[PDB]
PDB file of C-alpha atoms in Angstrom:
ATOM      1  CA  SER A   1      86.445  84.208  86.229  1.00 50.26           C
ATOM      2  CA  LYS A   2      87.322  86.303  83.178  1.00 48.30           C
ATOM      3  CA  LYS A   3      83.634  86.319  82.244  1.00 48.94           C
ATOM      4  CA  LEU A   4      82.783  87.616  85.717  1.00 48.67           C
ATOM      5  CA  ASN A   5      84.607  90.919  85.239  1.00 45.07           C
ATOM      6  CA  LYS A   6      82.862  91.207  81.871  1.00 46.40           C
ATOM      7  CA  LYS A   7      79.297  90.811  83.138  1.00 45.94           C
ATOM      8  CA  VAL A   8      80.170  92.948  86.161  1.00 45.08           C
ATOM      9  CA  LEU A   9      81.815  95.819  84.284  1.00 46.63           C
ATOM     10  CA  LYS A  10      78.852  95.678  81.902  1.00 49.53           C
ATOM     11  CA  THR A  11      76.234  95.934  84.649  1.00 49.72           C
ATOM     12  CA  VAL A  12      77.927  98.846  86.415  1.00 48.56           C
ATOM     13  CA  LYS A  13      78.728 100.477  83.074  1.00 49.70           C
ATOM     14  CA  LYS A  14      75.047 100.357  82.121  1.00 47.48           C
ATOM     15  CA  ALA A  15      73.892 101.819  85.437  1.00 48.33           C
ATOM     16  CA  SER A  16      76.674 104.409  85.289  1.00 47.81           C
ATOM     17  CA  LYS A  17      74.722 106.214  82.569  1.00 43.91           C
ATOM     18  CA  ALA A  18      71.438 105.556  84.372  1.00 45.80           C
ATOM     19  CA  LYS A  19      72.692 107.475  87.408  1.00 41.79           C
ATOM     20  CA  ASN A  20      72.803 104.391  89.634  1.00 41.40           C
ATOM     21  CA  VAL A  21      76.509 104.334  90.488  1.00 44.23           C
ATOM     22  CA  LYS A  22      78.459 106.451  92.973  1.00 44.87           C
ATOM     23  CA  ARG A  23      82.257 106.631  92.860  1.00 46.67           C
ATOM     24  CA  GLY A  24      84.649 108.437  95.182  1.00 44.81           C
ATOM     25  CA  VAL A  25      85.632 107.991  98.822  1.00 45.86           C
ATOM     26  CA  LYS A  26      82.849 110.402  99.773  1.00 44.71           C
ATOM     27  CA  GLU A  27      80.137 108.483  97.920  1.00 44.77           C
ATOM     28  CA  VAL A  28      81.512 105.305  99.497  1.00 47.43           C
ATOM     29  CA  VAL A  29      81.309 106.356 103.147  1.00 43.99           C
ATOM     30  CA  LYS A  30      77.955 107.970 102.369  1.00 44.13           C
ATOM     31  CA  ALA A  31      76.623 104.814 100.716  1.00 42.49           C
ATOM     32  CA  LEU A  32      77.614 102.749 103.753  1.00 42.96           C
ATOM     33  CA  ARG A  33      76.531 105.451 106.201  1.00 43.67           C
ATOM     34  CA  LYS A  34      73.148 106.372 104.722  1.00 43.10           C
ATOM     35  CA  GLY A  35      72.680 102.698 103.908  1.00 46.41           C
ATOM     36  CA  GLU A  36      72.420 103.529 100.213  1.00 49.11           C
ATOM     37  CA  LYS A  37      74.923 100.928  99.014  1.00 45.27           C
ATOM     38  CA  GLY A  38      75.033  98.235  96.346  1.00 43.66           C
ATOM     39  CA  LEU A  39      78.407  97.071  95.050  1.00 43.78           C
ATOM     40  CA  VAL A  40      81.901  98.223  96.016  1.00 45.58           C
ATOM     41  CA  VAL A  41      83.880  98.299  92.769  1.00 43.88           C
ATOM     42  CA  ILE A  42      87.609  98.264  93.510  1.00 42.77           C
ATOM     43  CA  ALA A  43      90.390  98.709  90.954  1.00 44.41           C
ATOM     44  CA  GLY A  44      92.491  95.554  90.943  1.00 46.93           C
ATOM     45  CA  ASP A  45      95.339  97.684  89.613  1.00 50.89           C
ATOM     46  CA  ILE A  46      94.887 100.392  92.245  1.00 49.64           C
ATOM     47  CA  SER A  47      94.309  99.217  95.815  1.00 47.29           C
ATOM     48  CA  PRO A  48      96.473 100.732  98.584  1.00 47.41           C
ATOM     49  CA  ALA A  49      96.542  99.690 102.241  1.00 45.28           C
ATOM     50  CA  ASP A  50      93.446 101.867 102.618  1.00 43.31           C
ATOM     51  CA  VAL A  51      91.137  99.614 100.601  1.00 42.74           C
ATOM     52  CA  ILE A  52      93.025  96.474 101.614  1.00 40.88           C
ATOM     53  CA  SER A  53      92.410  97.410 105.248  1.00 39.38           C
ATOM     54  CA  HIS A  54      88.839  98.661 104.864  1.00 40.53           C
ATOM     55  CA  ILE A  55      87.913  95.594 102.814  1.00 41.21           C
ATOM     56  CA  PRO A  56      88.280  93.104 105.697  1.00 40.90           C
ATOM     57  CA  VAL A  57      87.066  95.684 108.214  1.00 38.43           C
ATOM     58  CA  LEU A  58      83.894  96.770 106.420  1.00 38.02           C
ATOM     59  CA  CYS A  59      83.279  93.163 105.382  1.00 37.58           C
ATOM     60  CA  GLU A  60      83.863  91.687 108.838  1.00 39.37           C
ATOM     61  CA  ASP A  61      81.914  94.594 110.327  1.00 40.44           C
ATOM     62  CA  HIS A  62      78.750  94.501 108.216  1.00 40.51           C
ATOM     63  CA  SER A  63      79.827  92.323 105.289  1.00 39.41           C
ATOM     64  CA  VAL A  64      79.110  94.690 102.398  1.00 37.44           C
ATOM     65  CA  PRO A  65      79.047  93.480  98.768  1.00 35.42           C
ATOM     66  CA  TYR A  66      82.543  94.478  97.649  1.00 35.25           C
ATOM     67  CA  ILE A  67      83.943  93.340  94.302  1.00 34.58           C
ATOM     68  CA  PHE A  68      87.339  93.810  92.656  1.00 34.85           C
ATOM     69  CA  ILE A  69      88.050  94.432  88.971  1.00 35.07           C
ATOM     70  CA  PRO A  70      91.674  94.719  87.776  1.00 32.85           C
ATOM     71  CA  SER A  71      90.966  96.912  84.750  1.00 34.59           C
ATOM     72  CA  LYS A  72      91.428 100.685  84.598  1.00 35.26           C
ATOM     73  CA  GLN A  73      89.230 100.750  81.494  1.00 36.94           C
ATOM     74  CA  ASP A  74      86.418  99.150  83.494  1.00 40.45           C
ATOM     75  CA  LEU A  75      86.740 101.110  86.737  1.00 43.00           C
ATOM     76  CA  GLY A  76      87.063 104.269  84.665  1.00 48.31           C
ATOM     77  CA  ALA A  77      84.276 103.504  82.205  1.00 46.70           C
ATOM     78  CA  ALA A  78      82.074 102.749  85.213  1.00 46.31           C
ATOM     79  CA  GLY A  79      82.979 105.600  87.543  1.00 50.03           C
ATOM     80  CA  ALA A  80      84.025 108.261  85.046  1.00 50.00           C
ATOM     81  CA  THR A  81      86.014 107.830  81.832  1.00 51.44           C
ATOM     82  CA  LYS A  82      87.137 111.423  82.368  1.00 52.28           C
ATOM     83  CA  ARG A  83      87.778 111.049  86.098  1.00 53.07           C
ATOM     84  CA  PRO A  84      88.489 107.368  86.868  1.00 53.93           C
ATOM     85  CA  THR A  85      89.084 106.122  90.413  1.00 53.51           C
ATOM     86  CA  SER A  86      89.924 103.004  92.424  1.00 53.60           C
ATOM     87  CA  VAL A  87      87.050 103.086  94.914  1.00 56.97           C
ATOM     88  CA  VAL A  88      83.463 103.025  93.651  1.00 56.07           C
ATOM     89  CA  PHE A  89      80.104 102.185  95.225  1.00 58.33           C
ATOM     90  CA  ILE A  90      77.207 101.118  93.004  1.00 55.09           C
ATOM     91  CA  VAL A  91      73.639 101.818  94.119  1.00 57.99           C
ATOM     92  CA  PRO A  92      71.059  99.865  92.075  1.00 57.75           C
ATOM     93  CA  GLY A  93      67.981 101.745  93.247  1.00 56.51           C
ATOM     94  CA  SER A  94      64.810 102.381  91.259  1.00 56.01           C
ATOM     95  CA  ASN A  95      61.268 103.281  92.317  1.00 53.44           C
ATOM     96  CA  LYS A  96      59.344 103.235  89.035  1.00 53.13           C
ATOM     97  CA  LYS A  97      62.037 101.525  86.963  1.00 52.32           C
ATOM     98  CA  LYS A  98      61.646  98.585  89.345  1.00 50.24           C
ATOM     99  CA  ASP A  99      58.327  97.634  87.748  1.00 51.15           C
ATOM    100  CA  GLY A 100      58.925  99.569  84.543  1.00 50.70           C
ATOM    101  CA  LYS A 101      60.068  98.436  81.104  1.00 50.86           C
ATOM    102  CA  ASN A 102      63.700  99.485  81.527  1.00 51.92           C
ATOM    103  CA  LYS A 103      67.202  98.003  81.653  1.00 52.06           C
ATOM    104  CA  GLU A 104      66.679  97.813  85.417  1.00 50.97           C
ATOM    105  CA  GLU A 105      65.299  94.332  84.749  1.00 56.27           C
ATOM    106  CA  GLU A 106      68.325  92.587  83.242  1.00 56.74           C
ATOM    107  CA  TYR A 107      70.599  95.064  85.020  1.00 55.23           C
ATOM    108  CA  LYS A 108      69.339  94.432  88.552  1.00 55.80           C
ATOM    109  CA  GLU A 109      69.195  90.706  87.802  1.00 53.93           C
ATOM    110  CA  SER A 110      72.717  90.386  86.400  1.00 56.23           C
ATOM    111  CA  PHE A 111      73.999  92.744  89.095  1.00 54.45           C
ATOM    112  CA  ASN A 112      72.360  90.945  92.019  1.00 57.00           C
ATOM    113  CA  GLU A 113      73.877  87.769  90.576  1.00 56.91           C
ATOM    114  CA  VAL A 114      77.491  88.923  90.300  1.00 53.33           C
ATOM    115  CA  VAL A 115      77.241  90.878  93.552  1.00 50.87           C
ATOM    116  CA  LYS A 116      75.675  88.024  95.519  1.00 50.48           C
ATOM    117  CA  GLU A 117      78.355  85.684  94.175  1.00 51.40           C
ATOM    118  CA  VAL A 118      81.138  87.996  95.354  1.00 46.95           C
ATOM    119  CA  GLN A 119      79.594  88.209  98.823  1.00 46.52           C
ATOM    120  CA  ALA A 120      79.202  84.452  99.264  1.00 46.14           C
ATOM    121  CA  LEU A 121      82.721  83.859  97.946  1.00 46.02           C
TER     122      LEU A 121
END
């Protein structure tokens, strides 16, 4: 499992600089509302009744790909090292990068893997 958080934090961290991640309650509701979602990164260290209640609700409602990562360094380095949070929503979307020679390849792959795994489990 330890490796999971690694590969995960790495994927999101890479996309974070590629403008593919969206943190903040606002970005969350918007990602699930506009349909522009990807991976719900939750801070294992910070998770109030809000996330603990929305987790089973949003999951049992639509079953969105939500993952947890107990590591402030990760959640922060992914969302914003300067302004870290506990609720983040990744959005691996690329039009040209999809078929272009970019990190999107390994990124999307590794991401879809970790994400899919979290959903199934």
